[PDB]
Amino acid sequence: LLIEPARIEEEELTLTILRQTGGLGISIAGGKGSTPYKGDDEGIFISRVSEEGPAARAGVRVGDKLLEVNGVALQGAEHHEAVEALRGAGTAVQMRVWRERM
Amino acid sequence: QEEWETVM
Numbered sequence: 001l002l003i004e005p006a007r008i009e010e011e012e013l014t015l016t017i018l019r020q021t022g023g024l025g026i027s028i029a030g031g032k033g034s035t036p037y038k039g040d041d042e043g044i045f046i047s048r049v050s051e052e053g054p055a056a057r058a059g060v061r062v063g064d065k066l067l068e069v070n071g072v073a074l075q076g077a078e079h080h081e082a083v084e085a086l087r088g089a090g091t092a093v094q095m096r097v098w099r100e101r102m
Numbered sequence: 103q104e105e106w107e108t109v110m
Contacts, residue, residue: 026110027107027108028108029107030106035105037106048107079108
């Protein structure tokens, strides 16, 4: 018979993005008090990643939950707070993300 | 309320 292979169900990664004059190449969703992006999770998510853009080249994938940006935690953050964090993250945007499978 | 597409 066959056996289920080793499966990674969850990841927490640290990704470093190099912003271009155009920007990061993502779109974020969610926030405390907002219509949650996934389920009831009012956290911040990556809803879009531009192909071969900075975030793309850095390992970001659609659906990543955004937990922290350059040492600024986003727990319980509203959408605009996360927006202001990223707008000012600067050239090098080091984000910690959470990632499921499937 | 629904803010799902703030592009950056």
